[PDB]
Amino acid sequence: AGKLGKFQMLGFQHWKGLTSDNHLGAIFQQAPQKATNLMVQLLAFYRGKS
Amino acid sequence: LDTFLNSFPTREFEDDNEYYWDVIGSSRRNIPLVEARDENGVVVAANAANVGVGTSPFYLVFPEDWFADGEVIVGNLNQVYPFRILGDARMEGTNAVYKVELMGGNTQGVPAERLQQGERFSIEFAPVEKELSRKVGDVRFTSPVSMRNEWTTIRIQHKVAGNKLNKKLAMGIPMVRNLESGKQVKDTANMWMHYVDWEVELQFDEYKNNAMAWGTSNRNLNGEYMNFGKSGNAIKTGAGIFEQTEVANTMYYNTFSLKLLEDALYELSASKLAMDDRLFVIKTGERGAIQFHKEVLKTVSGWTTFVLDNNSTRVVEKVQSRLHSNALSAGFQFVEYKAPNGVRVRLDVDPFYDDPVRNKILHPMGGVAFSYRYDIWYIGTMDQPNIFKCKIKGDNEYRGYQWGIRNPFTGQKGNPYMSFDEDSAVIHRMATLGVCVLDPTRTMSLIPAILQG
Amino acid sequence: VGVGTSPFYLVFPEDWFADGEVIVGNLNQVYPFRILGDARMEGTNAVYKVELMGGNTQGVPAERLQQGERFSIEFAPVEKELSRKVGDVRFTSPVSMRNEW
Amino acid sequence: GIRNPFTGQKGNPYMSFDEDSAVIHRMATLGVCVLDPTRTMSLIPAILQG
Amino acid sequence: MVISINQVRQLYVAKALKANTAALTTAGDIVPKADTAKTTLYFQSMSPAGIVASDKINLKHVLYAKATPSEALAHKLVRYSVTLDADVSATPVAGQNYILRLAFRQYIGLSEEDQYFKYGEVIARSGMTASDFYKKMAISLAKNLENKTESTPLVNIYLISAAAASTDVPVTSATKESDLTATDYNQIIIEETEQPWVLGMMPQAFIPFTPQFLTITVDGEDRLWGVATVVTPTKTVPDGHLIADLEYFCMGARGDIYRGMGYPNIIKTTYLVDPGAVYDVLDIHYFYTGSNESVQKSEKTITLVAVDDGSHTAMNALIGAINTASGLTIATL
Amino acid sequence: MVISINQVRQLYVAKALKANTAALTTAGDIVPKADTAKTTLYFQSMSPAGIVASDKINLKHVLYAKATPSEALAHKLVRYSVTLDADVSATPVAGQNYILRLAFRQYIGLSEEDQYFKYGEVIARSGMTASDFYKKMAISLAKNLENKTESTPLVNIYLISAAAASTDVPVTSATKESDLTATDYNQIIIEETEQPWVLGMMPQAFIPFTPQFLTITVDGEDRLWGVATVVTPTKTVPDGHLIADLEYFCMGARGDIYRGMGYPNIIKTTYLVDPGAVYDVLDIHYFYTGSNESVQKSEKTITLVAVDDGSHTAMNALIGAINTASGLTIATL
Amino acid sequence: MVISINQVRQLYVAKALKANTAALTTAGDIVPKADTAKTTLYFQSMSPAGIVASDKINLKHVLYAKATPSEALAHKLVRYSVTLDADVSATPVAGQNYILRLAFRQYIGLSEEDQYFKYGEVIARSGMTASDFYKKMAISLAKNLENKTESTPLVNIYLISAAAASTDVPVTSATKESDLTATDYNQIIIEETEQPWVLGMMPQAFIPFTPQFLTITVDGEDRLWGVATVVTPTKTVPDGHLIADLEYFCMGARGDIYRGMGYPNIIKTTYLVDPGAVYDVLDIHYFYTGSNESVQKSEKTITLVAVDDGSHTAMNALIGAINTASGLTIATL
């Protein structure tokens, strides 16, 4: 229950009973999916190749 | 030192970017007690009478809600003072209070000393009726941890005038070629660059090695390096084997003993090693080997029950001389111990622990302290090298000359791309390297206290 | 001496160390000194300016820096961004002996 | 110096400086000719410049 | 830090107590709002991004509302007083190695099967006294525990002199006997240490130990050379780190759980507590019961963490406000 | 933000100025350290983790060292004074749509080819004075610009009652005609806004704008109804949000470049800049030159920051120390 | 004594200081010359073979110019002090062999892997006090070490009495317990010696040592009896034997690099420095920078040795001259 390395940031975590998505986000199990088939290209009339 | 660093394998990487690994751990737990309270909520002092002197209820305070309703928990005296929870934990901040009464046939209660801070508790089971029973119990979960490591860079250079291209030597005194061992050697080569080349490659391998072994970090807990290079950028110095390993399982003794050593080895073995894998090979110098002999001897001295016989021990032996018909030879050494319950203690003396150049602190008992230093580099098996040398796949080392009109190194007489107006050359060589110690807890190290400051 | 990665001067009887080299006294790898700035001749005694290179913050005791301390050469570390030249190499020569009748 | 990212060269026998870096240089010349300006009329606002 | 919940928990910082919903200017400010009929209760807290109102507490579905001080959350550091058992000898034996073994549990791993032992050795001489022995033991212990190469601050070694049995003097790997001049030393205290803390990553944990002595030969017989008596703790570990990990967790229920998961594309939550302050707590437990068929109780709790100043002000006022608003009778700290 | 470097730039915060290396206790303390010879210069700084020192400055290789004031780094918010030109008419002209177009060049993108146009409309009636017109126009501008729906702040509309030509009566989409009881309004000020800022991901930017008017038939001829003139700004955006992103960038040179990247496997850098304060700055440029063939220079930048009380007391004592220590004669702003 | 060069080092002796080039009659004489504009500096020394001139010093290319006194180049002979550690016992214990062991680190082979151990032994008797042990131990050490049998002078054994406490009485292999008649002896100091020197063939070196000890038995305990502690030195090896090889090396740049290889067929060089006098030194480091593209420096040194007996009169006068001629500000010592 201590720091083995010098920059060891995580610690052994533990909870009892009913969990929550917060419990899972506090142990790094919830991440937002990146919509790869989606991309906004801002619109303008590009007068640079003129 | 070279053989030492070759005792370890290498792992090729693909970048000079910090890398991190996952560290798995253990699960089984005991929950410490914070406090106990009477039926009236009053605190339980240590010089206090029993608590549940009937089946009276009382309160147990804990630093976390780890126990469920209807579970029976036990203290340090397991099976003697069982504790059944009388509900769910009424949290007071982060502390969790529980209502509890004594199971079993206890009718005199629990003494207060069995209810003080720090006492360890655990779950036993959830006992229930067989008719009209209601839900009880719960379960638990845990999570792992991880660790990091980084790299280092080194440079060297040597400048020589251009006239050194094919310069012959008169050999007034024999010309010498410094070796890695430190031994001067006589060489016939009459040219000066033969030796310049040798020394450059030599000093660069010496650079690389001192880093892989004695690498010391300059980084801060805020994440900042604090040694700034000539460019103004920071020098990102890593840590070496000895620095990496000496963070765990290291003792600094003023006096060595077999009790000290055998307790350490056994306590560690009963905890971590199976009875069939407690063979501990120790690396040290030959001054430590003598000290091991002296300690093993006095212990065996106190073995008064047995009479040790020169027949079996052959301490004193018969040799053929001309000064006598029965000529005798006396002398022995203790090079190994065998403690109880599977512990074997052997020695593997390396001269690296005796080098008088690297080690400049001297033991008052005749030698360099680094020889009075016992290390176990591999406590058990790992299915993996715990200690290895890191190598970027392609970006390992670079070579470059910035010279004028003639290059003594390569022996090129004309320059299509001159760097300056000077009959001179300078070789530049760079390399990148790293070292990793996954588990520093799997490296035991006894060290004399004079050897730290 | 050397509080806050502060600099200070190591005097020597010889110019044996290049700038950009880490040198270690008797307590090796406990107090690493980074030679910054080539040696300045004080006659035949070489004077270097140094910087402690092991995260040291408290410095080095005045007892580790008295006459006689042995100093070895560790290596020459550099940054990976715009790094300039550091390091050097060294040579030695033998001797002879003589007898008569 | 000792390596060139533009080309991928990791060591040169002909080094230019000790620093670990690299520099690129490009140079070109150009020119335009109008034989007769009087054949080009331009009606311009007085704000761009009078 | 992950914890156990009764299906939900919420936290709101009372950095300043106002009297209206119109005075919530600065973040952290809070007011308790209740009907004059006293049928519901809620709190208007000023968030950094504006204002909020906690869930509504039906005062007839209130299970328990208790206030907790900070002394009750400050972990009390275990001390071990160590001495020479006058039964074997009130003084050291002039040729025996006095080894001490501190066995540690809950070292890096989580379990008790994560054991770890550090030692301290003193070979004693003829003219040695108890004072000199304790001094040398402390140096041996510090050089192995209070060093600057051990990854963890295992313990804190101290020395006590009979002249001042109340004053404890520290001993580090740097300490030298010349700094320890008193000739009347009677014991060696060995405390725990506040371990490294990291908001949401490294919860406040400890590593307890037992000083287990080794045997000496006093009269041709193996006998232990000392006793490890527990004494009343003297140092504590303030609760600032606990409240901040509670806020970090309880602001993932009414907020973002992807605290950093996907780094540039996150929502940065602005936590309001100072891990260097001591807070005094108030936990109100209550539930929600529905209509005819929906009788099951959805139990809830919300925590209010105000700051302490020795006296428990900033909560006795908060308590008085909630008491006059909701009629509840909560006990002051 | 990201900046252009002359091969390096280091930043060090000067929260408190001390006179010794021993007085460095708090994480913002700083000492200018030099030798009597005036041959080198360095700064001893107190970090969240221990003391640190900056690269050593060769006082013979200094290229420039100038302290900028806080005023110089505050972006002035350009503001126009919009009126109706007395040549077309000094009063509104009934039945005409007095439209007003506000162009925005650096809208969400960062190019000048990413434009955005928001409008304000007012149709005039008989008996309409100029004050009534400006009132109605400011109101229609707010409802379209200072609404609770627009993704970004765009402008700050104001009104000026000629009786008080200084005070800028503000206006927002919530403001209603009745809240404006004056009759001597003479202009519609339109000022750019501070855009939102988050440390290290959203640089401190502005959206510049020009008011474009439209035509109205006054006596048979389509004519522009107003004249937009810029006036000396009166609201400045301090540098707190600027020094802060500077630090965020220049602290990854001393330390970690993987900021928050692998969220749980990170080095959390602690920053000392308050983005709600006002710092002066002291930038010093210098270089390192080698020996006899490495004469190429390596110019390296170092800058210092210090809060401004309004009279630059912190930085003035700072450089007064540096001048007593290094012989330089930087000017006390 | 091969030294390292920053592209070259030159040495010019100064046995006399003159005002003009017309006063240079005797060799060693020297004068500094510099135009009234102070743009160049050069020295005119009278060589044994006629007048000669130093290289030219571009006075705006001077890197460092510093002097060194005689007392800063004399190697101080280090010396320990050996005694009886009063902890074990403050008097010799009868029947025990006190075998001292001096370990020598840099013996013949120019390294630390080249070790050499000399010893000294004494068996203690009942009435043997500490004074009797010290002398008998000293005579024992002298016999083994003060050997003229030895190929090298290794150490000097001296004694000290509580009466004097500074006067060190010497102990050579010739002395005997009857010559040392004092009853109050306190310690055994051990200096290191000067070794034999030969310019160009045998550079000035030293053999360093530490007086280790072996174990006596006292109460069934193996215990060291002694404590060697360095003491502030009292004697120094003067400079002359070191300057002599400096110029023997720094003359082969000015002149013949074959300082004798085909003996009959050589250019014998006349060296002005007396290797039996003391000299203060004056180093001027500078460089030559070229034109448009040839900026690569070429650093150079100009060493100057002036006999300084007692007060540093000669070199001080020399410095006043160079500072008056070149406008420099070299510090006088």
Residue numbers in the entry:
A (entry chain F): 2 to 51
B (entry chain H): 52 to 504
C (entry chain I): 102 to 202
D (entry chain F): 455 to 504
E (entry chain h), F (entry chain g), G (entry chain i): 1 to 333
Q: What's in the article?
A:
The icosahedral reconstruction of the capsid, which was determined to a resolution of 3.01 Å, has an outer diameter of approximately 88 nm. The capsid has a triangulation number (T) of nine, with an asymmetric unit comprising nine copies of the major capsid protein (MCP) gp32, nine copies of the capsid auxiliary protein gp36, one copy of the trimeric head fibre protein (HFT) gp21, and two copies of the dimeric head fibre protein (HFD) gp29. The MCP adopts the HK97-like fold—the canonical fold of the capsid proteins of the viruses in the class Caudovirecetes14, with the main body comprising the A-domain and P-domain. A β-barrel insertion in the E-loop, composed of residues 79–180 (I-domain), is a widespread feature of the crassviruses. This insertion domain forms a three-fold symmetric assembly with the auxiliary protein at the capsid surface, making up much of the exposed surface of the capsid and contributing substantially to the capsid wall thickness and stability. The FD domain of the auxiliary protein interacts with the A-domain of the MCP, around the periphery of each hexamer and pentamer. Each hexamer can adopt one of two conformations: winged or planar. Winged hexons span the edges of the icosahedron, on both sides of the icosahedral two-fold symmetry axes, whereas planar hexons are positioned at the three-fold symmetry axes. At the centre of each hexon is a pocket formed by the MCP and auxiliary protein, which serves as a binding site for fibre proteins. A trimer of the head fibre protein gp21 (residues 1–38) binds in the planar hexon pocket at the three-fold symmetric site, whereas a dimer of the capsid fibre protein gp29 (residues 1–58) binds in the winged hexon.
Virus ΦcrAss001 (Kehishuvirus primarius) was the first representative of this order to be isolated in pure culture from human faecal samples. Here, we present the characterization of ΦcrAss001 using cryo-electron microscopy (cryo-EM), enabling de novo structure building and elucidation of functions for around 1,440 protein subunits constituting the virion, leading to the identification of a novel ‘crass fold’ in the distal part of the tail. The virion possesses a short non-contractile tail extending approximately 44 nm from an icosahedral capsid. The extended tail barrel formed by widely conserved paralogous ring proteins has a high capacity for storage of cargo proteins alongside the capsid cargo zone, ensuring that the proteins required for the initial stages of crassvirus infection are carried inside virions and delivered to the host cell.
